[PDB]
Structure formats: structure tokens, C-alpha cells
């Protein structure tokens, strides 16, 4: 008797967990990614304004 | 003392005699120019031959991404 009950109890929550983790992951990593892709571009930018002021002033 | 400062004088009256002569290779002979040209050229070296007499212009630029 007891065997099959524990087999079901494992499988049901398992499925919850793994999907809820799969959802949560992709949301977070991309919304994070969204902003990382900024940050990359734009860093370049501030550098060149910084640099210009030195460069001309020299 | 103004035999002393006669000579401070005496050179300073050629402060004025030469300065109000001209001064350069002048009161003084060619010699100055013959260096001068080279020495001011060294200044051109001292800045590089980047023209120290033309207003410079400035970089418009981009580093790399994906």
C-alpha cells in the first residue's frame, strides 16, 4: 500500500517545483539581461565624453 | 656704490642702448639667428611638428560591442 502513495506524493510536487523554477528563472535573467545590455553600451559613451574634455584640453 | 651701479647703469644704459637699438642678432651680429632658426625648430620638436599655431580639432569615436 504505502509504496504507491509516496510515489505519487513525490511526483506531484516535483512537477510544481520544476516548472515554477523554470518560469521564475527566465523572467529574472532576462529582465536582468535587459539592463546589462544597457550598461554595456552606455559605459562606452561616458568614457568618450570624459576623454574628449581631457583630449582637447591637452 | 654707483661705480658698481654705474656698471649696473653701464650695462643698463645698454639695456636701453641695445634695447632701443634692437637686440637679437642685432647689436650683436648674425650669430643669434643662425642658432635661432634651429633652436625654435627644436621647440617644434619639443611639441612635435603638430602645428603649435593651428587650433586643434578633436576625436569623435566609438569602442566596440555586440
Contacts of B62 (CB under 8 A, 6+ apart): A44, A48
Q: A33 vs chain B: nearest CA distance in angstroms?
A: 14
In a domain, B40, yes or no: yes
d(CA A25, CA A28) in angstroms, rounded, equals 5
Cell representation of residue B55: 587650433
Cell readout for B28 is 650683436
8 Å CB contact of A48 and B61 = yes
Cβ within 8 Å of residue A56, ≥6 positions away: B56, B58
Q: Is residue B61 part of a domain?
A: no
C-alpha dihedral, A15 to A18 to A22 to A24, nearest 10°: 100
Of the candidates B58, B59, B65, the beta carbon closest to that of A40 is on: B65
> Quick count: other Cβ atoms within 10 Å of Cβ B13?
12
B59 within domain boundaries: no
Say how many domains are in chain B: 1
The whole-angstrom distance between residue A28's C-alpha and the CA centroid of its chain comes to: 4
* CA distance to partner chain A, nearest, from residue B50 (Å): 13
CATH number (domain holding residue B5): 6.10.280.200
Domain that holds residue B42: 1-48
Amino acid at each position: 500500500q504505502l509504496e504507491e502513495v509516496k510515489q505519487a506524493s513525490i511526483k506531484q510536487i516535483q512537477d510544481a517545483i520544476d516548472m515554477e523554477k523554470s518560469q521564475q528563472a527566465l523572467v529574472q535573467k532576462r529582465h536582468y539581461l535587459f539592463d546589462v545590455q544597457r550598461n554595456n553600451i552606455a559605459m562606452a559613451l561616458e568614457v568618450t565624453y570624459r576623454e574628449r574634455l581631457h583630449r582637447v584640453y591637452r | 656704490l654707483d661705480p658698481v651701479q654705474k656698471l649696473f647703469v653701464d650695462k643698463i644704459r645698454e639695456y636701453r642702448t641695445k634695447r632701443q637699438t634692437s637686440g637679437g642678432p642685432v647689436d650683436a651680429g648674425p650669430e643669434y639667428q643662425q642658432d635661432l632658426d634651429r633652436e625654435l625648430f627644436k621647440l617644434k620638436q619639443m611639441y612635435g611638428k603638430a602645428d603649435m599655431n593651428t587650433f586643434p580639432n578633436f576625436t569623435f569615436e566609438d569602442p566596440k560591442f555586440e
